[PDB]
Amino acid sequence: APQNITELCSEYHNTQIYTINDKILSYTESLAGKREMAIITFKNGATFQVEVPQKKAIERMKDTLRIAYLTEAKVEKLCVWNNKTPNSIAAISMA
Amino acid sequence: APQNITELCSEYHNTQIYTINDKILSYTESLAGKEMAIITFKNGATFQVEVDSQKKAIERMKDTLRIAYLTEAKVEKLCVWNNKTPNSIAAISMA
Amino acid sequence: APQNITELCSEYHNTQIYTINDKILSYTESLAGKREMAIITFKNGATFQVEVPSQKKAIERMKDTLRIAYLTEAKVEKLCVWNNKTPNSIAAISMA
Amino acid sequence: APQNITELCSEYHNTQIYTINDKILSYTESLAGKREMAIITFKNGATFQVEVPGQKKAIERMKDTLRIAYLTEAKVEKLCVWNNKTPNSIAAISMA
Amino acid sequence: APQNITELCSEYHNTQIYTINDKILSYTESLAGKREMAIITFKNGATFQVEVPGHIDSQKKAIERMKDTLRIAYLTEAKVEKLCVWNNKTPNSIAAISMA
Ligand SMILES: CC(=O)N[C@H]1[C@@H](O[C@H]2[C@@H](O)[C@@H](CO)O[C@@H](O[C@H]3[C@H](O[C@@H]4O[C@@H](C)[C@@H](O)[C@@H](O)[C@@H]4O)[C@@H](O)[C@H](O)O[C@@H]3CO)[C@@H]2O[C@@H]2O[C@@H](C)[C@@H](O)[C@@H](O)[C@@H]2O)O[C@H](CO)[C@H](O)[C@@H]1O
Ligand SMILES: CC(=O)N[C@H]1[C@@H](O[C@H]2[C@@H](O)[C@@H](CO)O[C@@H](O[C@H]3[C@H](O[C@@H]4O[C@@H](C)[C@@H](O)[C@@H](O)[C@@H]4O)[C@@H](O)[C@H](O)O[C@@H]3CO)[C@@H]2O[C@@H]2O[C@@H](C)[C@@H](O)[C@@H](O)[C@@H]2O)O[C@H](CO)[C@H](O)[C@@H]1O
Ligand SMILES: CC(=O)N[C@H]1[C@@H](O[C@H]2[C@@H](O)[C@@H](CO)O[C@@H](O[C@H]3[C@H](O[C@@H]4O[C@@H](C)[C@@H](O)[C@@H](O)[C@@H]4O)[C@@H](O)[C@H](O)O[C@@H]3CO)[C@@H]2O[C@@H]2O[C@@H](C)[C@@H](O)[C@@H](O)[C@@H]2O)O[C@H](CO)[C@H](O)[C@@H]1O
Ligand SMILES: CC(=O)N[C@H]1[C@@H](O[C@H]2[C@@H](O)[C@@H](CO)O[C@@H](O[C@H]3[C@H](O[C@@H]4O[C@@H](C)[C@@H](O)[C@@H](O)[C@@H]4O)[C@@H](O)[C@H](O)O[C@@H]3CO)[C@@H]2O[C@@H]2O[C@@H](C)[C@@H](O)[C@@H](O)[C@@H]2O)O[C@H](CO)[C@H](O)[C@@H]1O
Ligand SMILES: CC(=O)N[C@H]1[C@@H](O[C@H]2[C@@H](O)[C@@H](CO)O[C@@H](O[C@H]3[C@H](O[C@@H]4O[C@@H](C)[C@@H](O)[C@@H](O)[C@@H]4O)[C@@H](O)[C@H](O)O[C@@H]3CO)[C@@H]2O[C@@H]2O[C@@H](C)[C@@H](O)[C@@H](O)[C@@H]2O)O[C@H](CO)[C@H](O)[C@@H]1O
C-alpha cells in the first residue's frame, strides 16, 4: 500500500496534492436531494467538496472534516480530484 | 457543483437562506413517533430537521446540530424550506 | 409542527415536562438481553430511562445524546417523559 | 424497568457488580478475525472484555462508550459483568 | 479470551507487537476507490495502515471502528501504548491497539 497521502494521490488520474497546513475556515453540509454534499474552505481561497455518492468512506470523510473544523485541527495536505469544481476530496492528512 | 451554501440553496424551490452568524441557543431532540429535532437562536428563529442517500444525510444533519450546539460553534447561514413550520433545514454553513 | 419541547410534550398522553436546569449526575447503559437500556439520574433525585426499543434510530440517537451530554456536563433544560413507566421514560430533551 | 445498574445486574445469572469508582487505566481494541473485542483494565488489577458478538447494536454502543470514557478519563462507578468468562464480560456500566 | 494485546497478538501468524508509548504524529484517510484506508505515523518512524476491507463479515464493523479510534486518538493526542500489526503488509497492518 502507499505509505503516505502523496504516494496514494499519485496512483490516481486527475488528482493533485494541495499542501494546506492550516485549519478549516468554513464547513458546509447539505441534506437536499441530489446535493447531499459537504464543502470546506480555507484562508488561502481554496474551496473543496466531498461529492455526492466507498459509500462508507465518503460518510467517514464528511465526519472527519466536521470534527477537524470544530476542533481547529491543522490539515496538512489534501489529495483532490481536479476535474470537478469544487475540487473533490480523495484523501486528507493531518499532522 | 455549487461552491457555497447560497448557490446550493438557489437550486431548490421553496427554499431560503437565513443569515445567522450566531451559536445555537437551544437544541431539542424527540424520539416520540410521528422524531423531531429543533434548534433556536437568540434572534428568535426556530428551525427543524424533518424525518436512501437522503436518509443518511438527515441523520448527519441532526448529528451536526447537536455537536455545533455543544461546541458553541458559530452558525453562519442556514438553507431552509420555508413552506414548513418551523422552517425545515436543507443545509448549514459554519465559519 | 411543534416549535418547542413544551408544545411537543403536550401532543402526547402520559407525559410531563421536568424542568431540570442541571447536568446529568450519572449515566448507565446496558447491553444485557431484553435490558438494552440507558438510565440517567440528577442531583434532585430523579431517575429516567431510555426504554428498551427510524423510530429505532431516534432511540439510538437519544442514548448518544445523553452519553455526550453526560460526558461534557451539558446543562439539561427540560425533559418530556412518559410517567406511566418506571423509571419515567424519556420522549424528548432540550438543552439551552 | 430496573432503576439502576445493580437492580439490572441482579436480574441475570452469572453476573456480579464491580464497584470501581476510578477512570479506565488501559483501553485495547482488536479487529483481528474471531477476536473483534475490546479489553479494559483498572489500577486495582481488574481486566474486563466486551465479548466478540455471537443486542448487536448495544454491544457496538458499549465499545463506543468504553473508548470515550477512557479518552475523557471518565470515572467508572460500577460494572455489571458475567463472571463465567475470562476476562469477565461487560453487561452494563455506570458512570458518576 | 486473551487478557491483553500481547496475548492476543501471539495467537496470529505474521504479527508482532510494536511498543510505541507515544501519541500519533499524523493521521491520513482516503476514500479513493480500492484505497479506502487509513495511515498513521509516529515520531519514531513507524507507519501503519488499517487495510482496505478485502476479511470475513464481522471484521467489517471492527475495521470501521479501528479507523474511528485512530482518528479520535490522533485528535485528542492519546498516547498509544502498543500496536499488534501484521508484518507481511507494508505499511504494517493494524490488528489491535492498546492505549494507556
Ligand atoms: C474560498 C473561496 O472564496 N473560494 C472561491 C474562489 O476560489 C478560487 C480562488 O481562490 C482562486 C484565486 O487564485 O484560486 C482558485 O484555485 C486555483 C488554484 O490556485 C491556487 O490555489 C488557491 C487555493 C490559492 O492559493 C491560489 O492563490 C493559488 O494560486 C490553482 O492551483 C489551480 O490550478 O486552479 C484553481 C482553480 O481551478 C480557487 O478555486 C477554488 O479552489 C480550488 C482549489 C478548486 O477547488 C476550485 O474548483 C475552486 O473553485 O473563487 C472561485 C471562483 O473561481 C469560487 O467562487 C470559490 O468559491
Ligand atoms: C425562538 C422563538 O421564540 N420562536 C417562536 C417565534 O418565532 C418567530 C418569531 O421570532 C417571529 C417574530 O416576528 O419571526 C418568525 O420568523 C419569521 C421571519 O422573521 C424574521 O426572522 C425571525 C427569526 C426574526 O429574526 C424576525 O425579526 C425576522 O423578521 C420572516 O423573515 C419570515 O418570512 O417569516 C417567519 C415566520 O414564518 C419566527 O418564526 C420562527 O422562525 C422562522 C425562521 C420559521 O422557521 C418559523 O416557522 C418559526 O415559527 O414565534 C412563533 C409563533 O409566532 C413560535 O412560537 C416560535 O417557536
Ligand atoms: C436518583 C435516585 O436515587 N432515584 C431513586 C428515587 O427517586 C425518587 C425520589 O427522588 C423521590 C423523592 O420524592 O421522587 C421520585 O420522583 C417523584 C416525583 O417527585 C419529584 O421529582 C423528584 C425527583 C424530586 O425532585 C421531588 O422533590 C419532586 O417532587 C413526582 O413529581 C412524581 O409524581 O412521582 C415521582 C415518583 O413516581 C423519584 O422517582 C424517580 O424519578 C422520577 C422522576 C420517576 O422517573 C420515577 O419513576 C423514579 O423512580 O427513588 C426511587 C424509588 O422510589 C428509585 O430508587 C430511584 O432510582
Ligand atoms: C490488570 C491486570 O494485570 N490483570 C491481570 C490479572 O488480573 C487478576 C488479578 O488482578 C487478581 C489479583 O488478585 O485479581 C483478579 O480478579 C479476581 C478478583 O480479585 C479481586 O478483584 C480484583 C479486581 C483485585 O482488586 C483483587 O485485589 C481482588 O482480590 C475476585 O473478586 C474474583 O472473584 O476473582 C477474580 C479472578 O477471576 C484479576 O483477574 C482479572 O480481572 C477480573 C475482574 C476478571 O475479569 C478476571 O477474569 C481477570 O483475569 O491476572 C490475570 C490472570 O490471573 C490476567 O493476567 C490479567 O491480565
Ligand atoms: C514515518 C515515516 O516516515 N515512515 C517511512 C519510513 O518508515 C520506515 C523507516 O522509519 C525505517 C527506519 O529504519 O523503519 C521501518 O520499519 C522497519 C522496522 O524498523 C524498526 O522500526 C521502525 C519503526 C524504526 O524505529 C526502526 O529504527 C526499527 O529498526 C523493522 O523492524 C521491520 O522488519 O522492517 C520495517 C520496514 O522496513 C519503517 O517502515 C514503516 O514502518 C514499519 C513499522 C512498517 O509498518 C513498514 O511497512 C513501514 O513502511 O520509510 C518507508 C520506506 O521504507 C516509508 O517512506 C515510510 O513512510
Verbal overview:
The first copy, chain A, is an alpha+beta fold and 95 residues long. Chain A contains two helices and six strands. Chain A has one domain: Beta Barrel (OB fold (Dihydrolipoamide Acetyltransferase, E2P)). Chain A has helices spanning 5-9, 55-71, and strands spanning 15-22, 26-30, 38-41, 47-50, 75-81, 87-94. The first copy, chain A, has a six-stranded mixed beta sheet with strand order 1-5-6-4-3-2. In chain A, strand 2 (26-30) and strand 3 (38-41) form a beta hairpin. The longest helix of chain A is centred in the middle third of the chain and has 17 residues, at 55-71. Chain A starts with a helix and ends with a strand. Chains in contact: A-B, A-E, B-C, C-D, D-E. Strand 2 (26-30) of chain C pairs antiparallel with strand 6 (88-95) of chain D, so a sheet runs across the interface. Bound molecules: a molecule of 5 linked components (BGC-GAL-FUC-A2G-FUC) (5 copies).
